Each structure stands twice: as structure tokens, then as C-alpha cells.
DNA sequence: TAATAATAGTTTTTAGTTTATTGGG
DNA sequence: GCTAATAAACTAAAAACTATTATTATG
């Protein structure tokens, strides 16, 4: 939540991410507790700013996938507002999720695909 | 500078809401346009720098970007506009429903899952700072997806989902005669007894026209009050009460109506050619001789300290004239920006005053070249309503203290005394004239007017609205309360042949 | 929430302008 | 109208002398006639100012018929100020070296008044006489004199080097001179003037006889020669069955300066070679211009701007009928706080003069509305171009007569709202009681009202309503310095305007001690200007 | 008016600098219609809006009479708004861009006007003298200096006074971050060199600068400082020849010590250049020196590579000045230019 | 090789004008 | 019976308020 300089809360993303997908080696699940107080801090004070956030999602999805289901919506709705790199981190967001193949392709012409995709960003 | 308001309007197109039990009485569809237009004119008037859109579904035929059948969006969010109110008051009336029906489908089936898709990729659509998403449905009927256990099952999953990512839904009872039939099927579904077979929850207020700026929270500036020289600590100062002037004109041509900008320039006479500041000479004749000077002495000349408050002592509430006025007051609140801890300090002094009664007196310096008055800081505490809500501000009062040369001399005055029956006289009318004063009880009629006719003018009425002035007496009432106290006071003390006019 | 404007959320219901009564 | 003016200053030497540390009183008594003469010239009063001196090294009256009147040499005659005046103040005038009894210099100036008033007429006739009262005097003439300012009314007002009733400040708080110092002649002078101008005047004679460092900060010197307010005729009116002629004044009012800032030429130093024009050209088509009276204003609507003349607006406008003052209602004083009282001035109305009954209805109404702790609402029109506004009528009772003040109210436009915190109910910036008792005791060290001794009165260390607004003081003492001295940097503000800015020392002293305590107890932190 | 504005004025700029003198001739007018614009009241442009005054700063026209009357209205505007800006006492020393501005400009002007003839000369340099911190990115003081480099004979005989403090800011400058403002400050430093040492060549009282100014800092002395100081013993031989000229060949004579030590990597070219002034000053060359010095050139010529462009471009404008200082003497011409020539 | 930091862009007064308009003589 | 300011409305103008964005730092 120290959002003061980048490596700070990069960092503790990189971990806890980390962690999330190493917890118990994937064998074992009672640390979802974990995984709620990660998320709610996420909604604390994050979702009012949401551009270390979007970060720190990022991060996290690129470290754990099934984490991103809690803010699919969400992970939308700040879609067209970006317009740098920004935009282009909370793309690989949604290529962490195979498991959202639920329905994706009204969401990405309704999120307007075709202009970020024209665009030449490689 | 905090976020901004969303407004999304969302109406059922089907059979329901152009019909009515009693057609005296306004169908819901057209009622809600009127209540559209009135939201509007106030949004016009108050925070037109918001967004606001149209959408309707279950009608016939869709347009949309989303491409979801039976849903159409009307507007855009955008700011209000005369083409907007012109546009939905082509279709108001028993006979714009009519066209609306004929050009327009309605009665459809629809997804309330398609609607809340179709409104949430709006939202995504404003890329600016917003703090109020508020989505209003009309309609009144809470089965038409009960009647599909899957589509309602969706539809509040969809809705909890929207809710829970700051979307707020607010409900707009319609005039149901079976009833609107709340807690069936909304209440655990919109976020937040009776079965309201009216539709009047707050539509009074919705339907109701207001004439406010409402401008945003701001700070005027934060001064920095310094005790005696290095003990200094941040405020805020704010006006609760500050005048409403009507907008300056906007500078425009005859013959195209766009604005014209207007350029000024100082130049010479003899020559007529352009000139420059360096060219222009403060001058001030006095008597016969001329003193020349320059602009930066002019502001040098206000320059004695730095912006800030300079404190010059303490002083018993009682030791202020009360016909002592000279400038609308302020209002001081503790900073805790520049000096961190002086809210602690704030909280000491105004408990300590308030015991003491006393008020503090400051040297005020507003900004850079300005001149130090003198400010009296009486103690404000806070007091809260019936339901706990701030009606007084925690703080401080800084009224202004007019010097010796900001008094005006009069020609004297005697005194000339009345006897004790004439005050009883005065105390009976007085009392046939009572009542309470709140400060929310009288407008400028006058602005008032002015944008009524504003309005008038830009929506091209043949007519504009009068507007209620308070502030003239009803005669009629008030002799009539009191009938025989006013010349029986004035038999008291005027002559019978001498009248108050000559 | 009570004593809140609903067309404009952060601002406080308006009431039509009471007038004068008489006691 | 116009008001005969003069100033009997004493060349004495003995005022030419003063305590080291202590401004000399003649060069105090030089700076109040340079900060008065400064005021009647850069104000443009029509008032003659004459300049009569006593004391001088030598004599000029037309009295002096040998032995009569000596030592007085008059330096100016009865006629408007200038520059000019200033200068010899600043200049020409020096301490003398003889002394000479001011009754003879008293009517010395009032027969040139006498032989100066003719010709004209004069609004009021007044001198101002500034001495130490070391000087010995002749108590001949007081029956005389009183006489004659009896039969003519010229009015006097006395000012001191040394106060009226340790620390030193000129034209601020703080003892002028200790009172232990004055020489019996000076106690003699005192005595004499007291009961002069106690039997001239009455109960309020010394209320006139001053200090120069006190009268630096008041208008007690141009207290006698100011202008009363205008009335504002009108008729106040209750239903449509009451009526009462009225006479208000604005009581408060905002002063502003009166002569703007001409431009002139920087070179010729002229504003006709210089003058100025405006040009509306079109944003577009490589400035086109649109000619002058083809603008015509709009306004922005919402998201749209109309074309709207003011033609249109004028026929449309809500008129206000007339000057009109009519009484809206009445509610309870405690219903209004300070917080709602708007606009720029105070309107202490009045009902119109000699009218015995509209007196006796206004002093019922004020017995009335104060026994019930009442107050009214009414509203005001100045005229038909007016904007009609709502305010406040609240008693005000003098010793002397009873009054009603008009201040205008506000209206729900006028009116905003910002939400706060409820900063008593701040777990995290709860005082603690060190710190409390430490503010208390700064308070005590602080508060400039003292409890006045054997009675329930309450005294000001800071009378701020009787000082003027110190702009104007600089102001002038730099246009002076231009026109003296068009070649020099401006004079920094004068120690004495500090004085007068600075509240009383003792206090300081007093809060020393709990001012070190409120910084050592409280942790305030800083950043970067 | 706003960041496309300030892109398109510096479009225009960089257009003159790059297309001049063949048909941009229809800028007159236009010249004219922007001092009327920049002329007007309503000061809405911002100070990096300021550029207008590069953009008034002109080269690529002849400049006819008409901008020679419009420049003396522009220069007393650049000294009023100086007085304005640079004053802290109204508390506004806000110089963002406007002082750079106003510096491009009298560039871009002085170039062929106001010379050293009349008082005001002095009265803009004093704006120079004033010239502490610039946040990270100094701008205007690395503009002062680059017009005091262009115009520093603009400003004779009244930079003789404040020599000492002239100097010391000038190190100061270039012993600074931001190796743009050191070169700058390293530019103006040696255009102040030469001006002072025409100065009290052509002074009669060169003894009276001599022993209060430079002999102090010369011995003083003992990074590049070392060869800024190479720099001014040579550039300070020539005033030496009017009075003590007996000692100048004395200095050349201990010159040769000093690239003994040299003999056995940046300093070349201060020594050729010094040598080179010492020798044009010198009449009678020790013969002894002739080889000595043949090596050394040979070396340096030999030492032309491990070097960036800049310092070859530096040791090649050395090497054309030495061949101009042995020009003088005929037979010394043809042999050692022979010699150099064969060893090379 | 990629992070921070003054920094200009919309509101809002407010000092100096500009309007004729009542008030008289 | 001989003309007389005046606050309102109108400007300019100046500051405070969020809101960003080169810039070294390091390699």
C-alpha cells in the first residue's frame, strides 16, 4: 500500500505473487484467506487511484492467474481510460486468463479491440 | 479537485408506461420526460461539466455499439445541451409518444444483463475523473424477469457485479396500478414497505427546478498564521456564504454568431504607432503639479509582510460592536498540509476560547502587495441536526474589524422617547406579524428571472417563466391582521391632520 | 442516505421554499 | 463646505530639547503637521490652512505694535495647501531659540481669522496649538479669549509631548513620558488650559488635549474638520397602510483612493500623446476585424452559447420599482449570527430629521424589538436600476439616542456548503493537558482586556477601530519623497507606522515564557516554501 | 496558444537556421506583424511562449533599416524586463525562459550593432554581472555566458573592473555539473582572455593590470585548469613584450621545461597555441630550441590519435597557429616546416 | 540508461474604470 | 430654475488549484 517509489510496491507484489502461486507448492489450499486480504487491499485505497494497481495486477496475474476473476469487470471498466504502456500492461491481464474464456470477445469489441490492436504498439 | 457525477437514464420502451389507468393523469413515459427535462435544466444551471445519458430497451429496434437487441441508446453521456432538450421534447406529450412509437419500436423483450452491459461499457467510456456513478431505471414491474428464473439469476448477478465495482443503482418507483412491488424483486437487487401502487418516492424534487451554482469544495488559499515569528501553523480559509454573480457575456458576432475575440493595445497619438509598457508612465496630478511614478512602487507601496495572519491578541466576544461590520466573513479550519500536528493545537485553542469566551485578534496579510487588516477569529463549535449532520461547522469566524477612516460621520441625532402603550401597540403588530426566519427562505428574484428567461430564450418559448418574488409584502394579509392597530398607533403618535407624507 | 439530494448525491434534499405562516 | 483652519506652532527652544531616546517634541510635533498637511493636500480639501508661529527668533504679525505680541512670526496666511507648504515644513521650519506666552499667539491667530474669514464663508473655524507647556505664560487674556471663542465658536484641540493621563513608542502603545518630569511650569499650563477649555467647552474638555504618539494612530486631529454622511431619502413602509420617511447613512463604509494612476508618455510624460483603442478582430481568416458595433454579446448555456443582446435583457429584466425600503417580517435575534451579515457597508438608518413622530414611532419600535430580543427583515431598493436585496434591522441604543442598523442578508445562491471533520471527536489530535495549560496560560499572557480596577468594566490594550488604514500614510510619505526627490530610492515605512502596527511590548513580555512552552510541547513540522 | 504553438515557433526557428538567404526575404512584414503581437497588452503568452524573442532574433536576412529602428525599441523592452525579472526585491525573480529569450535575441542582433562607442554598452553588460541556482538544468547562466563568448568585444573597457571576481566566476562555471554549461563557461572564459589581453596590449597601463591581476593568478595556478591556465601565460606573453620584454623569451624558455616534463595528454595544444602567441610576440628564437621544439610538434602530430573530434579539431587550429608564428622567420620557416614534415 | 521535479491549464476575486442616473437651483 | 456625483457593471489583472511532464541516475 506504500505507494511512494516503484520498486517498493513492485516488489511486494513480486512476492506475495510469488507466493500465491508457490503457497504450500500448490498442494494444499487454506492461505485463500490470504488471497482475500490480498485482494481486499487491492480494493483498499487502490481502486480509487488504480494506476499502481493496475501494476500490481498485473504482476500478480502474470504470477497467478486465477487471482484476476475478482476484478474482470474491473480489469474492463479501467481499460479505455489508459493510453501508454499502461493500457498495454492490463492487456497480458487478460492473457493470464485461459480460464476466462467464458466470453471475451463482446467484452473486447465493446472494450473497441480494433484500435489498440491497429495501432502499432508491437 | 475530487471526482465528477454519471448520470444514466434507462426507461422501459413496452406498453406500460404509455398507458394509464386515469389518462387525466400523466402516463408514465411522458412523465418521465418531464422529469428528464427538469433534471436536466437543473444540471444545466448547477454542474453542466458532467456527463449525462440517454438509453432505452425493450423496444423493437436497438442501436447501439454493444449491438444488443431491443436496446437503444437515445444520448450519449455528454454535458446537457438545448439540442438534448429539444430532442426528447419532440417526443413529450400525448402525442410525441405517438411519433415515438411510430419511429421508434417498444415492447419488446430485453436482458437486464444487456442493459447493465451496455451501461457499464458507457461508464468505461469517460476517461475523466469521476466520483458518482448513478444509473435511474423507469419502469414498474419487477416480474419481467421473474418471469425467467435464468435471466433474473443473471441479472442480479450482473447487478451485484456493477454495484460492487462503485456502480450505485437508484430506484424510480413508477405508477404501478397491480403495485411497483418492492422487496420481491429489487431491494435484492439495487443497491441501497409499501407496495407503491403511485410512483412518487422523490419525483417531487426530481421534477422540481433549481437556480444554483453549487460550486465544488475549493480552498480560497491556505495562509500560514504565524503565532509570533517562527511558530507558525497551516489553515484553510473558506467562504460558506460567498455572492452568486450572473456569468459575464460571452463577446460574439452579429452575422455568424461565433465568438469574435477582442485584442487591446496602447500606443502613441502624434505617430499613432504601437507602444510598450516601458512606454507608459504612472501619472497623478495634485493641485497643479504632476508626480511621476511606475506601477512597481504602486505595489511596493501595498507591501508590508508576507501573506500569512500575524496575531495581535485575545478579546472577550462582548467588546465587539454589533453595527461593527464592514465585509462578509470567513470561515478558518486546521490544516494539517505545510504543518503537520496543528490540528491537535487548533482543537486546544478553540476548546480553550470557547471556556474563555475570547476571540482572537489578527494582523491579516491575503497575499503578496496587500494590505494587513484586522480579523477577529471568534470560536465556532460544532453543531449537528436532528440526524447528527453538520449544520455549524467546527472552526472559526473571521469577521473584519473597519478601521477609524472606514467610519462615516453623522449629523446628530436626539433622542425622543414613546410612551409604553404605543409599545404595546408595536408589540400586537409585531406578533399578527410574526414568524421564523431560516436563511434558506429567500432567492435574488431578479437572477432568478434573468435565467428564466435564459432558458425561455434557448428553448425558443413563445413565453418565459415569471418568477415568485418573496420579498414583496402581501399587503392585503397583513392589514387584515392588523385592521384597527395601525391607525390607532398613528392617531397615538401622528396628528390626525398631519400624515407621515407632507 | 437520509437528508441527501437524490439528483445530486453529496448534496443535501432541497424542500420547496416554505414562505411564511402565521401562529 | 469649507473650514477655516489654522495651526499655532511654538518655535521654542525649550520643545526643541528632549530626553535622549526620546524624539525631540518639536521634531514629534513637525511629523504630526507633516502627516496632517500631507492628508489635507493629497485629500483636496477645500479648506484654507493658515500658519501662524510663536516663539520664533523673530516677529511677523500685524499685532506686533512693540512689546505685544512678540516672538510670533506668521509663515503662512489663510489660503489652500500645497507643495509648496510641505516643503517649508520639512524645510523652512527650525527650532527657534525664544519663547513668548501662547495666549498672545492665540489671539494672534484669531484676528487674522477674523481678517481672513471675510470675503467667504466657512463651515467650521478651527486651530490645533502644539506645546510642552515649559514655556511661561501670562494668564491675562483667558477671560478674553474664552469670550471671543465663545461669540465666534472656533474650535481647539491641545496635543503633548508627553501623554495626556519605562517603555517608549512613538505612535504606539506604551508610556510617551513619565509624568514625574513635567516642571511646574508645565503642571501650571496644564491646570490653566483645564479649566480654560473646561469652562469653554464643558464636561468633554479633556478629551481634546492629547499626545502627539497617540494621536499618530487616531483621527483626533481631523476630528473637528471632517464631513458628515449623506442621507438617503426614502420611506420605509409596513403593508400598504404604514409609511415613515427615512434618512439613512452608511455608518461603515470601505474607503478607496480617489485620484486613479494616469498613464502619460515616458519621454514627453503626457497622456494626451498616449491613448487607446481596442480592436475586435475575428480568431480566424488572418484576423479579419469585426467592426465595432458588429459584436453583440452572448452567454454560455450548459454545453451551448446563445446570441443574446442586452437589449433583450433590458426589456426582459425583473425591475425594481423605485427606492424602496419595505418590511419583509420579523423573526428572533438568535436566528442570525455574525457569519450572514453581507455586504460592503453598514447602513445605521435614520427616519427623517424633525420629524417628532416618525421619532416617537422608531424609539417605540426599538423598545419593542429589544424587550423581546427580536429583530426585523427588510427589504431594500436604492432606486429603479437597482438590484433589490434582503437584510437585517437590529437595534442600537447610544447614551444619547436610540437607532436601528440596516446590514444586507444573503440569499440560498449566496450560499455553499463544504463538509468538515469533526475535529473534537479526533481520537489521533486529542490535546493532552500539558499542552492544554500551557495555551491557558499563553491566553492569560496574551489577552489585551484587563479587568479595570473597583469596577466590572473591561479596558483595550488595541483600540483597532479608532486607527486608520495605513496605506495611505506611506502612501503619501513616498509621493512626497517623488515630488521632493524625483531621483531617489522611496523612504521604507516609518518606525512609527511599526508602532502603531505592533501591539503593546508588556504582552509580549507576558507571553514570552508560554510561548516557549507551546513550542516545546508541540511537535510542528515544516516544508519546503 | 499552447504546446503546438511552442513546437511551430520552434519550427520556424530551426527553418532559419536551415533556409537562409536564398528567397526568405518576405519575413519583413512579418517581422513587424510580430513586434506588434508581442507588443500587445494582453500578455497571455507564457514565458516559454517567450521564444518570440529568438524568433525576433534575426540573421537570415540583411536586416534593412526598418528592424535597425525596431532594435533599439527591442532593447530597452530587453532591459526593462531584465530590471523586472532579475529583481527579488518585488519577490519575483521568475525567469523561466524570458531571460534566454532576451538572450538569443541580442545574439542574434549584436551581431552587427552597438558596438563599444556609447554609455548604454556598459549598462546592458551590467545585466551580465548579475547572472546561484537554475535547477539541475541551468539554462540561463550557460546563456549568459554564450553571449558574453559572442559579444565580449562588445563589452571593452568597462569588463577591466570586477577582473578578479570575473575570473573566479567564470572557474566556478566551469568546475560545475552540466558539462554544456562548463564548455559554455570554458567559451566566454577565453573570449574574456583575449579581450583583456587586447586590452592591456593596447593600455599604457598594462603594468597596473599586470602586477594586480595576472601574475597573481599565473604563479597561482601551480584537469583541463591546468591548460586554462596554459592558455593565459600564453595568451599574457604579449603584454609582457611592451614592458620586461627581456623576460618574455624567459617564459618561452621555461615553456620548453614544461614540455620536457610533457616529453616523457590533453595539454598539446595549449602549449602549441601559447608557443605560437609567444613566438608571433617573440623576435629572437634560441636556435638550441629549433630541434627541441621540431620533436615536440612531431610528437604531437604523432599523439593526433586516442583523441575525441573535438580536441583533434582543437590541436589542428593549434597546429595552423604555430605555422602562422613560424612564418615570421624565413629560413625557420622553410626548415622546420621541411623537418615537421619529413618526421610526420 | 528509465526516475524524479518545477511546471502551465481552468476558476475567482478584485482594483480600476465606465453609465446614466437621480437630485437639485 | 442651470446644471452634477454614483454605485453597477465592466474590464483588466493578479494569485491558488489541481494536472500534468523533462530530468538526471545509472548503465
Given at each position: ?122 | ?102 419511429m421508434m419500436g417498444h415492447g419488446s423483450d430485453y436482458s437486464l444483463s444487456e442493459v447493465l452491459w451496455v451501461c457499464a461499457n458507457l461508464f468505461s467510456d469517460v476517461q475523466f475523473k469521476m466520483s458518482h456513478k448513478r444509473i435511474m431505471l423507469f419502469t414498474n414491474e419487477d416480474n419481467p424477469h421473474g418471469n425467467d428464473s435464468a435471466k433474473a439469476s443473471r441479472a442480479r448477478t450482473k447487478a451485484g457485479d456493477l454495484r460492487d465495482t462503485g456502480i450505485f443503482l437508484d430506484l424510480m ?230 478601521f477609524a477612516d472606514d467610519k462615516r460621520k453623522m449629523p446628530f441625532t436626539e433622542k425622543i422617547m414613546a410612551t409604553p402603550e404605543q409599545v404595546g401597540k408595536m408589540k400586537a403588530i409585531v406578533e399578527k406579524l410574526r414568524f421564523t426566519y431560516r436563511s434558506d427562505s429567500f432567492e435574488n428574484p431578479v437572477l432568478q428571472q434573468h435565467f428564466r428567461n435564459l432558458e425561455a430564450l434557448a428553448l425558443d418559448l413563445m413565453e418565459p417563466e415569471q418568477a415568485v418574488d418573496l420579498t414583496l ?30 | ?23 | ?466 486607527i486608520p488604514n495605513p496605506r495611505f500614510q506611506r502612501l503619501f510619505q513616498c509621493l512626497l519623497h517623488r515630488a521632493l526627490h524625483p531621483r531617489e530610492p522611496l523612504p521604507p515605512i516609518q518606525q512609527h507606522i511599526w508602532n502603531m502596527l505592533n501591539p503593546p511590548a508588556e504582552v509580549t513580555t507576558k507571553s514570552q515564557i508560554p510561548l516557549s512552552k507551546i513550542k516545546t510541547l508541540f511537535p510542528l513540522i515544516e516544508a519546503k516554501k | 496558444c499552447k504546446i503546438p504553438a511552442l513546437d ?337
Amino acid at each position: 500500500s506504500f505507494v511512494r517509489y516503484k520498486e517498493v510496491y513492485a516488489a511486494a507484489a513480486e512476492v506475495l505473487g510469488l507466493i500465491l502461486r508457490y503457497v504450500m507448492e500448490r498442494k494444499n489450499i487454506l492461505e485463500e484467506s490470504l488471497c482475500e486480504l490480498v485482494a481486499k487491499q487491492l480494493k483498499q485505497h487502490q481502486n480509487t487511484m488504480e494506476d499502481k494497481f493496475i501494476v500490481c495486477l498485473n504482476k500478480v496475474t502474470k504470477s497467478f492467474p486465477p487471482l484476476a476473476d475478482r476484478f474482470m469487470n474491473a480489469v474492463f471498466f479501467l481499460l479505455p481510460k489508459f493510453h501508454g504502456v499502461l493500457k498495454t500492461l492490463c492487456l497480458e491481464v487478460v492473457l493470464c486468463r485461459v480460464e476466462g474464456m467464458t466470453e471475451l470477445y463482446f467484452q473486447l469489441k465493446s472494450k473497441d479491440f480494433v484500435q489498440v490492436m491497429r495501432h502499432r504498439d508491437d | 479537485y475530487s471526482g465528477r457525477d454519471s448520470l444514466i437514464f434507462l426507461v422501459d420502451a413496452s406498453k406500460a408506461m404509455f398507458e394509464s389507468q386515469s389518462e387525466d393523469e400523466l402516463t408514465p413515459f411522458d412523465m418521465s420526460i418531464q422529469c428528464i427535462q427538469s433534471v436536466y435544466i437543473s444540471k444545466i444551471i448547477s454542474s453542466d461539466r458532467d456527463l449525462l445519458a440517454v438509453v432505452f430497451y425493450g423496444t423493437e429496434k436497438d442501436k447501439n455499439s454493444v449491438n444488443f437487441k431491443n436496446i437503444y441508446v437515445l444520448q450519449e453521456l455528454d454535458n446537457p445541451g438545448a439540442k438534448r432538450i429539444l430532442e426528447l421534447d419532440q417526443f413529450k406529450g400525448q402525442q410525441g409518444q405517438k411519433r415515438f412509437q411510430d419511429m421508434m419500436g417498444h415492447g419488446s423483450d430485453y436482458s437486464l444483463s444487456e442493459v447493465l452491459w451496455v451501461c457499464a461499457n458507457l461508464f468505461s467510456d469517460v476517461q475523466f475523473k469521476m466520483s458518482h456513478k448513478r444509473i435511474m431505471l423507469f419502469t414498474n414491474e419487477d416480474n419481467p424477469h421473474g418471469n425467467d428464473s435464468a435471466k433474473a439469476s443473471r441479472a442480479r448477478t450482473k447487478a451485484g457485479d456493477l454495484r460492487d465495482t462503485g456502480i450505485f443503482l437508484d430506484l424510480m418507483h413508477l405508477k404501478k396500478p397491480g403495485g411497483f412491488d418492492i422487496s420481491l424483486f429489487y431491494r435484492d437487487i439495487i443497491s441501497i414497505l409499501r407496495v407503491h401502487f403511485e410512483e412518487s418516492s422523490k419525483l417531487e424534487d426530481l421534477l422540481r427546478k433549481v437556480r444554483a451554482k453549487e460550486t465544488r469544495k475549493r480552498a480560497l488559499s491556505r495562509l500560514k498564521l504565524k503565532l509570533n515569528k517562527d511558530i507558525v501553523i497551516s489553515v484553510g480559509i473558506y467562504n460558506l456564504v460567498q455572492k452568486a454573480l450572473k456569468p459575464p457575456p460571452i463577446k460574439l458576432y452579429r452575422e455568424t454568431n461565433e465568438p469574435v475575440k477582442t485584442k487591446t493595445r496602447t500606443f502613441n497619438t502624434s505617430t499613432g504607432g504601437l507602444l510598450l509598457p516601458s512606454d507608459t508612465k504612472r501619472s497623478q496630478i495634485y493641485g497643479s503639479r504632476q508626480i511621476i511614478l511606475e506601477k512597481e512602487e504602486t505595489e511596493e507601496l501595498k507591501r508590508f509582510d508576507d501573506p500569512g495572519l500575524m496575531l495581535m491578541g485575545f478579546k472577550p466576544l462582548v467588546l465587539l460592536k454589533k453595527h461593527h461590520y464592514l465585509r462578509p466573513s470567513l470561515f478558518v479550519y486546521p490544516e494539517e498540509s505545510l504543518v503537520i500536528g496543528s490540528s491537535t493545537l487548533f482543537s486546544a485553542l478553540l476548546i480553550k476560547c470557547l471556556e474563555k469566551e475570547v476571540a482572537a485578534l489578527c494582523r491579516y496579510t491575503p497575499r503578496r502587495n496587500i494590505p494587513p487588516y484586522f480579523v477577529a477569529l471568534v470560536p465556532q463549535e460544532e453543531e449537528l441536526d436532528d440526524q447528527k449532520i453538520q449544520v455549524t461547522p467546527p472552526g472559526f469566524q473571521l469577521v473584519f474589524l473597519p478601521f477609524a477612516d472606514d467610519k462615516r460621520k453623522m449629523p446628530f441625532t436626539e433622542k425622543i422617547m414613546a410612551t409604553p402603550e404605543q409599545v404595546g401597540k408595536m408589540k400586537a403588530i409585531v406578533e399578527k406579524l410574526r414568524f421564523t426566519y431560516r436563511s434558506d427562505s429567500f432567492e435574488n428574484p431578479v437572477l432568478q428571472q434573468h435565467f428564466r428567461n435564459l432558458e425561455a430564450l434557448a428553448l425558443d418559448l413563445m413565453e418565459p417563466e415569471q418568477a415568485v418574488d418573496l420579498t414583496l409584502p402581501k399587503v392585503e394579509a397583513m392589514n387584515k391582521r392588523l385592521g384597527s392597530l395601525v391607525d390607532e398607533f398613528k392617531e397615538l403618535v401622528y396628528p390626525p391632520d398631519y400624515n407621515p407624507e407632507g | 442516505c437520509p437528508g441527501e439530494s437524490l439528483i445530486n448525491p453529496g448534496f443535501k434534499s432541497k424542500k420547496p421554499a416554505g414562505g411564511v405562516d402565521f401562529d | 463646505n469649507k473650514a477655516a483652519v489654522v495651526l499655532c506652532m511654538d518655535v521654542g527652544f525649550t520643545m526643541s530639547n528632549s530626553i535622549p531616546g526620546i524624539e525631540s517634541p518639536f521634531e514629534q510635533a513637525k511629523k504630526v503637521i507633516t502627516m496632517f498637511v500631507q492628508r489635507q493636500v493629497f485629500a483636496e480639501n477645500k479648506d484654507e490652512i493658515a500658519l501662524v508661529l510663536f516663539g520664533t527668533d523673530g516677529t511677523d504679525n500685524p499685532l506686533s505694535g512693540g512689546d505685544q505680541y512678540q516672538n510670533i512670526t506668521v509663515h503662512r496666511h489663510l489660503m489652500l495647501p500645497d507643495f509648496d507648504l510641505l516643503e517649508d515644513i520639512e524645510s523652512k521650519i527650525q527650532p527657534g531659540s525664544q519663547q513668548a506666552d501662547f495666549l498672545d499667539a492665540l489671539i494672534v491667530s484669531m484676528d487674522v481669522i477674523q481678517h481672513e474669514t471675510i470675503g467667504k464663508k466657512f463651515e467650521k473655524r478651527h486651530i490645533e496649538i502644539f506645546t510642552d507647556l515649559s514655556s511661561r505664560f501670562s494668564k491675562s487674556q483667558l477671560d478674553i479669549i474664552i469670550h471671543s471663542l465663545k461669540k465666534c465658536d472656533i474650535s481647539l484641540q491641545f496635543f503633548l509631548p508627553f501623554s495626556l493621563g519605562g517603555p517608549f513608542r512613538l505612535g504606539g502603545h506604551g508610556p510617551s513620558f513619565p509624568l514625574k518630569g513635567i516642571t511646574e511650569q508645565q503642571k501650571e499650563g496644564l491646570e490653566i488650559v483645564k479649566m480654560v477649555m473646561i469652562s469653554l467647552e464643558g464636561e468633554d474638555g479633556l478629551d481634546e488635549i492629547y499626545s502627539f504618539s497617540e494621536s499618530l494612530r487616531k483621527l483626533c486631529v481631523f476630528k473637528k474638520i471632517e464631513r458628515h454622511s449623506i442621507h438617503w431619502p426614502c420611506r420605509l413602509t409596513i403593508g400598504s397602510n404604514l409609511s415613515i420617511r427615512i434618512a439613512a447613512y452608511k455608518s461603515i463604509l470601505q474607503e478607496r483612493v480617489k485620484k486613479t494612476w494616469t498613464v502619460v508618455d515616458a519621454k514627453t510624460l503626457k497622456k494626451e500623446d498616449i491613448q487607446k483603442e481596442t480592436v475586435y478582430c475575428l480568431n480566424d481568416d488572418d484576423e479579419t476585424e469585426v467592426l465595432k458595433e458588429d459584436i453583440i454579446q452572448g452567454f454560455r448555456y450548459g454545453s451551448d452559447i446563445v446570441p443574446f443582446s442586452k437589449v433583450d435583457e433590458e426589456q426582459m429584466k425583473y425591475k425594481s420599482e423605485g427606492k424602496c425600503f419595505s418590511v419583509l417580517g420579523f423573526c428572533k435575534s438568535s436566528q442570525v449570527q455574525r457569519r450572514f451579515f453581507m455586504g460592503n457597508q453598514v447602513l445605521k438608518v435614520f427616519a427623517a430629521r424633525d420629524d417628532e413622530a416618525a421619532a416617537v414611532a422608531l424609539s417605540s419600535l426599538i423598545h419593542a424589538l429589544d424587550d423581546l430580543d427580536m429583530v426585523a427583515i427588510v427589504r431594500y431598493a436604492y432606486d429603479k436600476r437597482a438590484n433589490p436585496q434582503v437584510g437585517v434591522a437590529f437595534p442600537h441604543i447610544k447614551h444619547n439616542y436610540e437607532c436601528l442598523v440596516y446590514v444586507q442578508l444573503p440569499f440560498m445562491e449566496d450560499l455553499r456548503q463544504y463538509m468538515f471533520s469533526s475535529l473534537k471527536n479526533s481520537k489521533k489530535y486529542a490535546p493532552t493537558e500539558a499542552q492544554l495549560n500551557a495555551v491557558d496560560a499563553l491566553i492569560d499572557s496574551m489577552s489585551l482586556a484587563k479587568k479595570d480596577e473597583k469596577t466590572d468594566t473591561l479596558e483595550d490594550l488595541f483600540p483597532t477601530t479608532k486607527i486608520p488604514n495605513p496605506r495611505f500614510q506611506r502612501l503619501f510619505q513616498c509621493l512626497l519623497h517623488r515630488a521632493l526627490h524625483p531621483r531617489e530610492p522611496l523612504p521604507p515605512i516609518q518606525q512609527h507606522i511599526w508602532n502603531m502596527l505592533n501591539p503593546p511590548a508588556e504582552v509580549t513580555t507576558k507571553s514570552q515564557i508560554p510561548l516557549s512552552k507551546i513550542k516545546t510541547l508541540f511537535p510542528l513540522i515544516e516544508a519546503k516554501k | 496558444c499552447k504546446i503546438p504553438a511552442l513546437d511551430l515557433l520552434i519550427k520556424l526557428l530551426q527553418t532559419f537556421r536551415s533556409s537562409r538567404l536564398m528567397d526568405e526575404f518576405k519575413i519583413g512584414e512579418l517581422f513587424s506583424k510580430f513586434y506588434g503581437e508581442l507588443a500587445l497588452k494582453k500578455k497571455i503568452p507564457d514565458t516559454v511562449l517567450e521564444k518570440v524573442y529568438e524568433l525576433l532574433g534575426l540573421l537570415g536576412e540583411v536586416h534593412p533599416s526598418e528592424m535597425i529602428n525596431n532594435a533599439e525599441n527591442l532593447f530597452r523592452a530587453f532591459l526593462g524586463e531584465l530590471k523586472t525579472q532579475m529583481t527579488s526585491a518585488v519577490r519575483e525573480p521568475k525567469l523561466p525562459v524570458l531571460a534566454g529569450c532576451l538572450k538569443g535575441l541580442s545574439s542574434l542582433l549584436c551581431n552587427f550593432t552597438k558596438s563599444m562607442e556609447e554609455d548604454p554598452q556598459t549598462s546592458r553588460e551590467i545585466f551580465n554581472f548579475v547572472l546561484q541556482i537554475d535547477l539541475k538544468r541551468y539554462a540561463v547562466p550557460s546563456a549568459g555566458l554564450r553571449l558574453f563568448a559572442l559579444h565580449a568585444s562588445q563589452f571593452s573597457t568597462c569588463l577591466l573592473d570586477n577582473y578578479v571576481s570575473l575570473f573566479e566566476v567564470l572557474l566556478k562555471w566551469c568546475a560545475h555539473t552540466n558539462v554544456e554549461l562548463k564548455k559554455a563557461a570554458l567559451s566566454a572564459l577565453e573570449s574574456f582572455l583575449k579581450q583583456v589581453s587586447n586590452m592591456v596590449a593596447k593600455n599604457a597601463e598594462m603594468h597596473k593590470n599586470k602586477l594586480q591581476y595576472f601574475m597573481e593568478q599565473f604563479y597561482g595556478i601551480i584537469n583541463k585548469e591546468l591548460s586554462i591556465a596554459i592558455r593565459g601565460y600564453g595568451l599574457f606573453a604579449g603584454p609582457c613584450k611592451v614592458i620586461n620584454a627581456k623576460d618574455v623569451d624567459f617564459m618561452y624558455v621555461e615553456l620548453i621545461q614544461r614540455c620536457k616534463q610533457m616529453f616523457l595528454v590533453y595539454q598539446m595544444p595549449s602549449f602549441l597555441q601559447s608557443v605560437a602567441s609567444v613566438l608571433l610576440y617573440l623576435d629572437t628564437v634560441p636556435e638550441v630550441y629549433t630541434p627541441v621544439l621540431e620533436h615536440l610538434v612531431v610528437m604531437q602530430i604523432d599523439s593526433f590519435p586516442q583523441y575525441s573530434p573535438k580536441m583533434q579539431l582543437v590541436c589542428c587550429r593549434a597546429i595552423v597557429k604555430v605555422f602562422l608564428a613560424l612564418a615570421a622567420k624565413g629560413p625557420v620557416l622553410r626548415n622546420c616546416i621541411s623537418t615537421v614534415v619529413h618526421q610526420g
